[PDB]
Amino acid sequence: ASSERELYEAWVELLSWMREYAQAKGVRFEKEADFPDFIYRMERPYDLPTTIMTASLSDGLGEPFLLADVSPRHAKLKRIGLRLPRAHIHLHAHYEPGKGLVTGKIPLTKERFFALADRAREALAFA
Amino acid sequence: MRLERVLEEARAKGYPIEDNGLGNLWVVLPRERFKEEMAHYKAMGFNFLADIVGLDYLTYPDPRPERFAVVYELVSLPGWKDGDGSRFFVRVYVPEEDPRLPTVTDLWGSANFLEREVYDLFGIVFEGHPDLRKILTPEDLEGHPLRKDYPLGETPTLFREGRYIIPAEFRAALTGKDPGLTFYKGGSRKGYRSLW
Amino acid sequence: ACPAYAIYVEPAENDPENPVSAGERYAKVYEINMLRCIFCGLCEEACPTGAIVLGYDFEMADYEYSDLVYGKEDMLVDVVGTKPQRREAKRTGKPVKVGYVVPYVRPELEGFKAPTEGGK
Amino acid sequence: MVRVGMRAAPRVSLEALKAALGGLKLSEAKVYLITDWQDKRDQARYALLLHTGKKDLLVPDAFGPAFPGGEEALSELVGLLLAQGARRFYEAVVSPGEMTALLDLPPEELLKRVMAIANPTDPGIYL
Amino acid sequence: REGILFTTLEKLVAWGRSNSLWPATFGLACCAIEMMASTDARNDLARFGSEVFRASPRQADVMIVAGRLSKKMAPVMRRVWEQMPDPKWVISMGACASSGGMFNNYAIVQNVDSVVPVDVYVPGCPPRPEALIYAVMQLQKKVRGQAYNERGERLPPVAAWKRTRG
Amino acid sequence: QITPPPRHLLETSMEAVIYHFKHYTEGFHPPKGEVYVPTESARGELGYYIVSDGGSMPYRVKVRAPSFVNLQSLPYACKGEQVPDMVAIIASLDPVMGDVDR
Amino acid sequence: MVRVKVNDRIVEVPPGTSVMDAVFHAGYDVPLFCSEKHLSPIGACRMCLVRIGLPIQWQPKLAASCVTAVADGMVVDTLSDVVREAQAGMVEFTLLNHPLDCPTCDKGGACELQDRTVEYGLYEKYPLELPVYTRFEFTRRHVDKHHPLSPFVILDRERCIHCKRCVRYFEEVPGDEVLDFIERGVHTFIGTMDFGLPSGFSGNITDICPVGALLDLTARFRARNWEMEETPTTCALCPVGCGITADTRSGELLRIRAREVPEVNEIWICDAGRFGHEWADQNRLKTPLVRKEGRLVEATWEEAFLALKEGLKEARGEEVGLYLAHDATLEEGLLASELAKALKTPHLDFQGRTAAPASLFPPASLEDLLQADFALVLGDPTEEAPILHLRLSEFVRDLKPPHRYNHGTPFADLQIKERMPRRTDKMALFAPYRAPLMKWAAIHEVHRPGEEREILLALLGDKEGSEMVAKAKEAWEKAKNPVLILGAGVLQDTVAAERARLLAERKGAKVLAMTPAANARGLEAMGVLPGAKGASWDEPGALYAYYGFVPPEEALKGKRFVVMHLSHLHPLAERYAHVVLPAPTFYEKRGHLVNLEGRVLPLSPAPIENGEAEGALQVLALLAEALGVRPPFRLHLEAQKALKARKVPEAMGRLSFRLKELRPKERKGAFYLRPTMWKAHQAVGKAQEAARAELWAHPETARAEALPEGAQVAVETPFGRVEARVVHREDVPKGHLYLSALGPAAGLRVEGRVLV
Ligand code: SF4
Ligand code: SF4
Ligand code: SF4
Ligand code: SF4
Ligand code: SF4
Ligand code: FES
């Protein structure tokens, strides 16, 4: 259906939170990779709101501890994903209408993500 | 019809018969039998002599009998007196140190220019020719351009501030002997043909 | 894809703060030797990001060899005219008049402004 | 094939060539002024390869306005070659790196390459 | 007297020479066909003053190198330049002539400016007939003293006026 | 191997990117062998004798230039004819010297 | 030998051959990701699959030709439809999650995945049907991107196809485990807890990675793989002369890569040679300078030659210095020799001249090193002759040179199994500090400088050594084919080299001499050594001098005429030199060198921006003109003729030359000049902090001498003034300070001081 749209919109919203945390704890954030269907679209028209697909929070050593990704424009089984490297931790969120951004059945709010990234910073970050 | 008779005449004396599945035929005559056989070929009804195509196989991946090889193209026009339409090639190998070959000028006047061209482009002299005079390359040009030991002689392409290109070191294309930028080439980049 | 090897592309690394391309790479130096260029259309054909596309201006006769190497800021869609045309518009004070009209611009030329069949 | 003169010393190269040329008649000789960058002659450097057919003469990169006294030396040189009856003048455009190594290739390859790449040139560009 | 030595007379004769450009083609390759097409009933260089076409070089001021200049032709064409009246101009038409083009090889002159002093270069392959007109108008304003390079310099009216022929 | 992938799936498929890149840089490598095909152009029988070595670039391309063999018949054609007619007999032969000199 | 049949061809092949090598030796082809030359084959990419029959007895499942041994009379089928369809399927699985970066990927055209994809993928399915490339229409794997693992290497975890090449190499070749996977499943990825990437041989993975995961940061975003102009040459940073590729485009240095030459370095290069190229294209001298107003001025070659004439008008021929660099070619040495013969001067030398020549000893080839029984090593291969370490790693593991097939080095050597054990009984290493190789040498003793001679004496048996030296002596007496390996510490102390000569002659044994100078043995072979008087490169004995290198500050001081022939500009020249001239590096030179094993090696010239630089052949010829003496050499062809007259074998040919003469000098021992892999002139750009100067001190004596663990201490040595980070090391002896000698002046014991 059309929920996809808001999902990408919601996806953009997610990025904001990430950036905010960067200023809070003074930790390095990096834009990892942009959309291929936006680089390699030559004349084809493009309606998506933002051009960024993958980003991450890297520690002082540059090694990431938190990764966030969004599904491409034409792929099947679209989702938004989160991963903690080296910790065997994967989260798979959808956008359910009325509820909001939810990890499966459980809502994914700003506070939950802030806590998760703070835990990763305290635990996994080497320096 | 006369091409089948050509094949039957050649096979009896031990002449190799080359064929690709595309409709092209080769009959390789040795140089001794070359002149008399091709005289007979004109006698067999070959009105038209299409081409004299010389080949220099210096950089060919696989070895060949001799470095140079000259191929004549014999045809019989279907619309003339008794026209069959049989067209085929005759290849004759010519050594690097023996660029000799009898002319078919006496047979066909068509080879008057054509053979001259191969003397220009290859070091191959065609014996008995009225005039073997350099045709295409300048009179003061030294050597024979189309043989592989003769450089193509490229010039760099020019840009703003010292940025230049030497095309020979810029080519992503490979030759047959060029190994490539990876450890090896297999599959499609070792030779590729679709099965219709 | 140039049969003359007439295009020089020095690449460089994007600055995330104020980027130039969408990926991690851009063209620091992008030159074309109009005296080497033969105008095939193979470069437009091989561009995967649709950056290089042949246009419509033919009025690029100039006097000096070194003046016929067109640069990046001499070919960006935002530019209006050819090198001698723009130079004459500056040493003359009169804007550039292109010597052509087209029925439209193709979709591959998104952004390229041109006179269209009499719409203006 | 002989090599006279020295790199980046226009007057030394020119005087040595004066001495070595002598009474050699150049009616059928071939003069190859080797340079780089077709268009920009104001900073140009030149080698010289003179192919008499019976013996050859090599001058390294010491001519052209690129060196002090080099423009007047190239003018004197081309005027000298024209005085001796030459009509065939040639200019080869090589890569900068080629200019150096090409004088260190064996004589046969250097001479073949220069003869293959040389362009007919008007001595008026050097006078 | 060279079209010089009076403030009014030199502008007058520059006007005259500019609109009196007598193109002398030296048709070499497929460039030459696109120059001949610049004479048909869609786009004729027969207005600005270029109607008459004297094959003799003793009679024309503009020499248009239209095509690839092979080395075996380089002196012959050369001599036609030497056998021209002195107020003469030379245009290099196309890619093979202007630079070595795509034929970057043993056979072709990699810039015709080697043998003849070129006035204007006109890229294209072939340069559109309207582009060849553009180059002849370019040369028109060049001989008027109305032409400048990218570096700010004004270009002299006649190339082949600055060379020691030999 | 012969066609680069369509331009729209350059942003969807990896194999498309690899094949587009490779096709337009390296090209394809036809098998080792020789071939020739006849056609009728405005100046006669035309064909390319192509010797391929299995590499991206052909080992040799020989051209049967119909204007090359068509020109051997000029001294015969304009033999005994008038002097002014030598131009007409040449224009009437229809030579394209881009084909002859080549 | 065993007979194998591939699809139409029958091949003799030695028994231990892998099926993959039998296919390629037979002339056929098969995809290849998991396996690599000199690496243990393990069936991982599952690309090497063939069909195998051993009676017609076709195998049920496809055979892994990378880890299959061959048996007599076996049928190998790589063209059956099943094999081609399976190979295309595996390519599909491998490219499944790839990041779509080819056009902007630094790997570009020289990417094995690209080539094998276009080779074997998309089997001919049977119409002119509209074909589909990929079935994977789901979300791809996304992980961390463009992550610099180290100042030389960048990491893209998305491009990794999970081969084993970098980790296989890291365990096998250097013996330095600084890389391995983290997780499993499809979430597997490469990482490290050793962040500095400490191993001195990490760069080779840059070349091995069949994808663009690990790329060279010093050559990231310069040009495309096909665009770079390749110059195959030989590296003269250290005397092993590994075969390198200098990739340059538009007159500047882009990238250094490996050139395979199994005779000396197999396919491996050290990080110093490969990443330490920033200095060549960056800042170097292009115009000759002349002293006019008691200062330096840009000058023509003419005016410099005139000043040269005048300065050497009143110079007698026996007081002139002829001093070349440690990397000077055979041509240059032979001409300086002949020119000091004509212009009779006893003192000519080169930069890395040892008191005891390397020519004393018989050279050994590296494959002999693989076949030896023992190796008695004194010095640090990692720093004095880096790639030796790698060859010692074949030596310690019982590996031996494989057979040479029709496709060159074997792709799957069954001789290399994975996780091979390393013998502690095959070698005995003595260094002044605890080297990484001491891990594989049970017989090992950390000594102090000037102590080697005693270890060697004890190995002879004229005195009694430690427990370790007794074991080394015992194994050396018992060994049938031992190798003696002498660093600079031995080669710079005349008596120690003398006892080595004695020890290596008495038992028939050849020597590997890790000279500080690359072409030391060749210049000795061409006759570059001082005479009776003896103003060598470090001595101020001469009155007029020509210098081709950087002399100690005291060697310039006092002279009447000093000319340096440099590539970069040195303050010692703008304060003590009268005429400076530009020289091309070894990167862009052309000539020959002699390996530390006696093998001659070619130098091809690189399209780097030399400026108006000229080779020292031309300078010495031009300098003798001012002296009256006529030169015998002008060019490289006449130089090569005269070389062949000097009986120097063809390229790759080993030159036989012994020499029975020693030139000893005292060493005032307060500081040590630790031999360093990193060379001083390489401290530019990304090696700036890697090739930094260090001062190693014992924690007790560092603490007593007030040297903090991180402090930048300024040190003044005869070889210059440099600041150096202090490192506390509990293996460095008390009372000494090991200063990182970033030049080919290593192994010397010199005076000096730590300035405040
Ligand atoms: S149109 Fe010009 S730049 Fe583009 S590929 Fe062709 S000749 Fe080269
Ligand atoms: S520039 Fe193009 S049109 Fe002109 S001669 Fe050359 S190939 Fe023909
Ligand atoms: S690793 Fe190879 S296939 Fe992958 S993006 Fe780079 S060039 Fe393309
Ligand atoms: S990073 Fe490269 S070399 Fe290492 S396992 Fe992955 S593909 Fe292999
Ligand atoms: S080991 Fe020595 S010769 Fe080899 S690459 Fe390193 S510095 Fe150069
Ligand atoms: S499985 Fe990788 S090639 Fe054998």
mmCIF file of N, CA, C and O in Angstrom, chain B residues 26 48 50-60 62 87 91 109-110 112-113 117 136 146 148 173-176 188-189 192, chain F residues 1-2 25-26 29-32 34-36 38 45 49 51-57 59-60 62 64 68-69 71-72 100-102:
data_model
loop_
_atom_site.group_PDB
_atom_site.id
_atom_site.type_symbol
_atom_site.label_atom_id
_atom_site.label_comp_id
_atom_site.label_asym_id
_atom_site.label_seq_id
_atom_site.Cartn_x
_atom_site.Cartn_y
_atom_site.Cartn_z
ATOM 1 N N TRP B 26 37.792 -22.010 -47.126
ATOM 2 C CA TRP B 26 39.192 -21.793 -47.469
ATOM 3 C C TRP B 26 39.776 -23.063 -48.069
ATOM 4 O O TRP B 26 39.467 -24.177 -47.616
ATOM 5 N N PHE B 48 36.081 -13.308 -61.796
ATOM 6 C CA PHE B 48 36.255 -12.146 -60.939
ATOM 7 C C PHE B 48 37.212 -12.483 -59.804
ATOM 8 O O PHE B 48 37.046 -13.509 -59.136
ATOM 9 N N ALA B 50 38.194 -10.898 -56.406
ATOM 10 C CA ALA B 50 37.717 -9.860 -55.505
ATOM 11 C C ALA B 50 38.870 -9.165 -54.786
ATOM 12 O O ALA B 50 39.099 -7.966 -54.980
ATOM 13 N N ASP B 51 39.632 -9.905 -53.972
ATOM 14 C CA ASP B 51 40.595 -9.323 -53.036
ATOM 15 C C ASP B 51 41.922 -10.044 -53.034
ATOM 16 O O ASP B 51 42.024 -11.240 -53.299
ATOM 17 N N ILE B 52 42.922 -9.282 -52.626
ATOM 18 C CA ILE B 52 44.221 -9.787 -52.211
ATOM 19 C C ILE B 52 44.443 -9.199 -50.824
ATOM 20 O O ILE B 52 44.761 -8.012 -50.687
ATOM 21 N N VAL B 53 44.232 -10.015 -49.795
ATOM 22 C CA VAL B 53 44.273 -9.597 -48.403
ATOM 23 C C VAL B 53 45.482 -10.260 -47.762
ATOM 24 O O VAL B 53 45.538 -11.486 -47.632
ATOM 25 N N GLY B 54 46.468 -9.454 -47.385
ATOM 26 C CA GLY B 54 47.633 -9.966 -46.696
ATOM 27 C C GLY B 54 47.450 -9.837 -45.199
ATOM 28 O O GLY B 54 46.777 -8.924 -44.732
ATOM 29 N N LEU B 55 48.042 -10.781 -44.462
ATOM 30 C CA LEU B 55 47.889 -10.917 -43.014
ATOM 31 C C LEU B 55 49.257 -11.118 -42.367
ATOM 32 O O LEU B 55 50.040 -11.955 -42.833
ATOM 33 N N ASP B 56 49.560 -10.352 -41.312
ATOM 34 C CA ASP B 56 50.799 -10.505 -40.543
ATOM 35 C C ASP B 56 50.449 -10.994 -39.140
ATOM 36 O O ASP B 56 49.836 -10.257 -38.357
ATOM 37 N N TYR B 57 50.889 -12.209 -38.803
ATOM 38 C CA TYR B 57 50.461 -12.906 -37.595
ATOM 39 C C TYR B 57 51.483 -12.847 -36.469
ATOM 40 O O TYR B 57 51.528 -13.758 -35.633
ATOM 41 N N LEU B 58 52.280 -11.776 -36.406
ATOM 42 C CA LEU B 58 53.364 -11.681 -35.429
ATOM 43 C C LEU B 58 52.857 -11.784 -33.992
ATOM 44 O O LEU B 58 53.393 -12.551 -33.184
ATOM 45 N N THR B 59 51.840 -10.996 -33.648
ATOM 46 C CA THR B 59 51.279 -10.953 -32.305
ATOM 47 C C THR B 59 50.073 -11.877 -32.142
ATOM 48 O O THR B 59 49.314 -11.719 -31.185
ATOM 49 N N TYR B 60 49.903 -12.867 -33.024
ATOM 50 C CA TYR B 60 48.731 -13.715 -32.841
ATOM 51 C C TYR B 60 48.971 -14.674 -31.674
ATOM 52 O O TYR B 60 50.085 -15.181 -31.519
ATOM 53 N N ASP B 62 48.082 -17.847 -30.887
ATOM 54 C CA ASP B 62 48.503 -19.154 -31.363
ATOM 55 C C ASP B 62 49.542 -19.012 -32.477
ATOM 56 O O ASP B 62 49.526 -18.035 -33.227
ATOM 57 N N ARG B 87 31.982 -18.555 -54.884
ATOM 58 C CA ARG B 87 33.013 -17.645 -54.405
ATOM 59 C C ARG B 87 33.746 -18.265 -53.225
ATOM 60 O O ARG B 87 33.116 -18.837 -52.335
ATOM 61 N N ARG B 91 44.287 -19.255 -49.497
ATOM 62 C CA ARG B 91 45.331 -18.723 -48.642
ATOM 63 C C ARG B 91 46.667 -19.362 -48.980
ATOM 64 O O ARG B 91 46.758 -20.576 -49.188
ATOM 65 N N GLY B 109 43.788 -8.687 -64.365
ATOM 66 C CA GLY B 109 44.358 -7.375 -64.176
ATOM 67 C C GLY B 109 43.964 -6.738 -62.869
ATOM 68 O O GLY B 109 44.582 -5.746 -62.468
ATOM 69 N N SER B 110 42.982 -7.322 -62.176
ATOM 70 C CA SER B 110 42.507 -6.758 -60.920
ATOM 71 C C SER B 110 43.626 -6.664 -59.886
ATOM 72 O O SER B 110 43.686 -5.705 -59.109
ATOM 73 N N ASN B 112 46.553 -5.788 -60.255
ATOM 74 C CA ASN B 112 47.557 -4.763 -60.521
ATOM 75 C C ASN B 112 47.691 -3.811 -59.342
ATOM 76 O O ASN B 112 48.787 -3.607 -58.823
ATOM 77 N N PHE B 113 46.589 -3.179 -58.932
ATOM 78 C CA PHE B 113 46.649 -2.305 -57.765
ATOM 79 C C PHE B 113 46.732 -3.121 -56.485
ATOM 80 O O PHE B 113 47.557 -2.839 -55.608
ATOM 81 N N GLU B 117 49.190 -2.703 -53.232
ATOM 82 C CA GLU B 117 48.819 -2.282 -51.891
ATOM 83 C C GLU B 117 49.495 -3.133 -50.820
ATOM 84 O O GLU B 117 49.996 -2.594 -49.826
ATOM 85 N N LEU B 136 50.068 3.713 -51.369
ATOM 86 C CA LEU B 136 49.355 4.533 -50.402
ATOM 87 C C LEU B 136 50.271 5.365 -49.495
ATOM 88 O O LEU B 136 50.019 6.556 -49.294
ATOM 89 N N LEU B 146 51.072 -1.942 -42.197
ATOM 90 C CA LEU B 146 50.118 -2.854 -41.569
ATOM 91 C C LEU B 146 50.727 -4.078 -40.897
ATOM 92 O O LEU B 146 49.970 -4.842 -40.287
ATOM 93 N N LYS B 148 52.598 -5.989 -37.932
ATOM 94 C CA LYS B 148 52.494 -5.761 -36.485
ATOM 95 C C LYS B 148 53.770 -5.219 -35.846
ATOM 96 O O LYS B 148 53.703 -4.621 -34.764
ATOM 97 N N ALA B 173 40.632 -2.050 -23.219
ATOM 98 C CA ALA B 173 40.495 -3.154 -24.140
ATOM 99 C C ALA B 173 41.718 -4.051 -24.037
ATOM 100 O O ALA B 173 42.819 -3.591 -23.749
ATOM 101 N N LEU B 174 41.538 -5.330 -24.315
ATOM 102 C CA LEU B 174 42.638 -6.277 -24.316
ATOM 103 C C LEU B 174 42.852 -6.745 -25.741
ATOM 104 O O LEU B 174 42.015 -6.522 -26.617
ATOM 105 N N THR B 175 44.056 -7.208 -26.005
ATOM 106 C CA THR B 175 44.330 -7.928 -27.226
ATOM 107 C C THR B 175 44.254 -9.427 -26.911
ATOM 108 O O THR B 175 43.891 -9.835 -25.804
ATOM 109 N N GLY B 176 44.581 -10.271 -27.889
ATOM 110 C CA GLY B 176 44.497 -11.704 -27.647
ATOM 111 C C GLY B 176 45.547 -12.196 -26.672
ATOM 112 O O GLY B 176 45.283 -13.092 -25.868
ATOM 113 N N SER B 188 33.968 -15.747 -20.841
ATOM 114 C CA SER B 188 33.630 -14.877 -21.962
ATOM 115 C C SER B 188 34.843 -14.118 -22.469
ATOM 116 O O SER B 188 34.946 -13.826 -23.664
ATOM 117 N N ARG B 189 35.736 -13.721 -21.565
ATOM 118 C CA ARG B 189 36.936 -12.997 -21.942
ATOM 119 C C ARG B 189 38.096 -13.918 -22.259
ATOM 120 O O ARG B 189 39.244 -13.501 -22.171
ATOM 121 N N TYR B 192 34.247 -15.847 -26.855
ATOM 122 C CA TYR B 192 32.834 -16.012 -26.558
ATOM 123 C C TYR B 192 32.020 -16.157 -27.833
ATOM 124 O O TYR B 192 32.151 -15.352 -28.761
ATOM 125 N N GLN F 1 26.275 -10.308 -22.990
ATOM 126 C CA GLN F 1 27.631 -10.225 -23.519
ATOM 127 C C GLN F 1 27.725 -9.295 -24.719
ATOM 128 O O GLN F 1 28.814 -8.787 -25.014
ATOM 129 N N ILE F 2 26.616 -9.094 -25.431
ATOM 130 C CA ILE F 2 26.576 -8.229 -26.596
ATOM 131 C C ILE F 2 25.806 -6.932 -26.345
ATOM 132 O O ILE F 2 26.030 -5.950 -27.059
ATOM 133 N N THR F 25 33.730 -0.471 -21.071
ATOM 134 C CA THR F 25 35.191 -0.369 -20.972
ATOM 135 C C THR F 25 35.896 -1.476 -21.742
ATOM 136 O O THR F 25 36.585 -1.222 -22.730
ATOM 137 N N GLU F 26 35.688 -2.716 -21.341
ATOM 138 C CA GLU F 26 36.410 -3.787 -22.001
ATOM 139 C C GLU F 26 35.777 -4.144 -23.322
ATOM 140 O O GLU F 26 36.485 -4.297 -24.319
ATOM 141 N N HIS F 29 34.643 -10.157 -26.173
ATOM 142 C CA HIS F 29 35.747 -10.846 -26.838
ATOM 143 C C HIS F 29 35.178 -11.919 -27.749
ATOM 144 O O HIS F 29 34.897 -13.036 -27.284
ATOM 145 N N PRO F 30 35.053 -11.669 -29.051
ATOM 146 C CA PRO F 30 34.547 -12.704 -29.968
ATOM 147 C C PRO F 30 35.551 -13.835 -30.107
ATOM 148 O O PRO F 30 36.704 -13.693 -29.682
ATOM 149 N N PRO F 31 35.160 -14.985 -30.655
ATOM 150 C CA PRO F 31 36.076 -16.132 -30.653
ATOM 151 C C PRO F 31 37.228 -15.874 -31.611
ATOM 152 O O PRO F 31 37.247 -14.893 -32.349
ATOM 153 N N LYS F 32 38.208 -16.768 -31.598
ATOM 154 C CA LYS F 32 39.293 -16.674 -32.568
ATOM 155 C C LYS F 32 38.802 -17.159 -33.922
ATOM 156 O O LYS F 32 38.310 -18.286 -34.039
ATOM 157 N N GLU F 34 38.208 -15.929 -38.494
ATOM 158 C CA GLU F 34 38.060 -14.974 -39.582
ATOM 159 C C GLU F 34 36.650 -15.046 -40.172
ATOM 160 O O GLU F 34 36.002 -16.096 -40.152
ATOM 161 N N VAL F 35 36.170 -13.909 -40.689
ATOM 162 C CA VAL F 35 34.825 -13.822 -41.255
ATOM 163 C C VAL F 35 34.786 -12.728 -42.315
ATOM 164 O O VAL F 35 35.654 -11.862 -42.378
ATOM 165 N N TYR F 36 33.760 -12.776 -43.158
ATOM 166 C CA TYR F 36 33.600 -11.821 -44.245
ATOM 167 C C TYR F 36 32.150 -11.899 -44.725
ATOM 168 O O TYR F 36 31.570 -12.987 -44.765
ATOM 169 N N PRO F 38 29.364 -10.040 -47.802
ATOM 170 C CA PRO F 38 29.206 -9.121 -48.942
ATOM 171 C C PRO F 38 27.937 -8.282 -48.877
ATOM 172 O O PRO F 38 26.871 -8.750 -48.475
ATOM 173 N N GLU F 45 30.630 -4.118 -54.549
ATOM 174 C CA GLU F 45 30.696 -5.155 -53.539
ATOM 175 C C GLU F 45 31.531 -4.662 -52.372
ATOM 176 O O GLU F 45 32.668 -4.203 -52.556
ATOM 177 N N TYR F 49 36.860 -8.260 -44.091
ATOM 178 C CA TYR F 49 37.531 -9.499 -43.719
ATOM 179 C C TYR F 49 38.101 -9.249 -42.333
ATOM 180 O O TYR F 49 39.101 -8.545 -42.181
ATOM 181 N N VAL F 51 39.669 -10.589 -38.902
ATOM 182 C CA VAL F 51 40.419 -11.602 -38.181
ATOM 183 C C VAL F 51 40.395 -11.176 -36.720
ATOM 184 O O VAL F 51 40.936 -10.116 -36.369
ATOM 185 N N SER F 52 39.745 -11.981 -35.879
ATOM 186 C CA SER F 52 39.657 -11.749 -34.447
ATOM 187 C C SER F 52 40.493 -12.786 -33.722
ATOM 188 O O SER F 52 40.520 -13.961 -34.118
ATOM 189 N N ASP F 53 41.160 -12.331 -32.660
ATOM 190 C CA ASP F 53 42.078 -13.126 -31.866
ATOM 191 C C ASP F 53 41.501 -13.492 -30.510
ATOM 192 O O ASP F 53 42.233 -13.991 -29.654
ATOM 193 N N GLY F 54 40.204 -13.308 -30.309
ATOM 194 C CA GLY F 54 39.625 -13.511 -29.004
ATOM 195 C C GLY F 54 39.799 -12.357 -28.050
ATOM 196 O O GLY F 54 39.532 -12.521 -26.856
ATOM 197 N N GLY F 55 40.250 -11.198 -28.530
ATOM 198 C CA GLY F 55 40.457 -10.038 -27.698
ATOM 199 C C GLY F 55 39.423 -8.962 -27.976
ATOM 200 O O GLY F 55 38.672 -9.006 -28.946
ATOM 201 N N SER F 56 39.397 -7.973 -27.088
ATOM 202 C CA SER F 56 38.462 -6.862 -27.188
ATOM 203 C C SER F 56 38.601 -6.085 -28.493
ATOM 204 O O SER F 56 37.628 -5.514 -28.983
ATOM 205 N N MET F 57 39.805 -6.061 -29.057
ATOM 206 C CA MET F 57 40.013 -5.339 -30.286
ATOM 207 C C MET F 57 40.384 -6.301 -31.400
ATOM 208 O O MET F 57 41.094 -7.287 -31.165
ATOM 209 N N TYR F 59 42.014 -8.377 -34.375
ATOM 210 C CA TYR F 59 43.421 -8.572 -34.718
ATOM 211 C C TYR F 59 43.767 -7.880 -36.029
ATOM 212 O O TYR F 59 44.846 -7.287 -36.159
ATOM 213 N N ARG F 60 42.870 -7.951 -37.011
ATOM 214 C CA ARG F 60 43.008 -7.157 -38.228
ATOM 215 C C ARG F 60 41.662 -7.027 -38.919
ATOM 216 O O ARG F 60 40.842 -7.944 -38.874
ATOM 217 N N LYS F 62 40.539 -6.061 -42.704
ATOM 218 C CA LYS F 62 40.845 -5.726 -44.088
ATOM 219 C C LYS F 62 39.539 -5.377 -44.774
ATOM 220 O O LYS F 62 38.504 -5.989 -44.513
ATOM 221 N N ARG F 64 37.487 -4.711 -48.292
ATOM 222 C CA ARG F 64 37.390 -4.783 -49.743
ATOM 223 C C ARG F 64 36.778 -3.460 -50.152
ATOM 224 O O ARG F 64 35.564 -3.277 -50.057
ATOM 225 N N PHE F 68 38.414 0.816 -54.749
ATOM 226 C CA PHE F 68 39.826 0.589 -54.997
ATOM 227 C C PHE F 68 40.022 -0.194 -56.298
ATOM 228 O O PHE F 68 40.779 0.233 -57.172
ATOM 229 N N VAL F 69 39.288 -1.301 -56.463
ATOM 230 C CA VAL F 69 39.286 -2.107 -57.693
ATOM 231 C C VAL F 69 38.495 -1.470 -58.841
ATOM 232 O O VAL F 69 38.675 -1.858 -60.004
ATOM 233 N N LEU F 71 38.846 1.563 -59.660
ATOM 234 C CA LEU F 71 39.729 2.583 -60.213
ATOM 235 C C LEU F 71 40.780 2.032 -61.175
ATOM 236 O O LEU F 71 41.364 2.808 -61.938
ATOM 237 N N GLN F 72 41.064 0.734 -61.145
ATOM 238 C CA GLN F 72 42.022 0.179 -62.089
ATOM 239 C C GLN F 72 41.580 0.326 -63.542
ATOM 240 O O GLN F 72 42.422 0.218 -64.444
ATOM 241 N N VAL F 100 39.083 4.728 -51.608
ATOM 242 C CA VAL F 100 40.288 4.262 -52.303
ATOM 243 C C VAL F 100 41.517 4.359 -51.403
ATOM 244 O O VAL F 100 42.158 3.351 -51.083
ATOM 245 N N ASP F 101 41.880 5.585 -51.011
ATOM 246 C CA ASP F 101 43.097 5.827 -50.236
ATOM 247 C C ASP F 101 43.031 5.131 -48.877
ATOM 248 O O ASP F 101 43.933 4.367 -48.509
ATOM 249 N N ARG F 102 41.995 5.429 -48.097
ATOM 250 C CA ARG F 102 41.557 4.584 -46.984
ATOM 251 C C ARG F 102 42.643 4.520 -45.918
ATOM 252 O O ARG F 102 43.131 3.474 -45.511
#
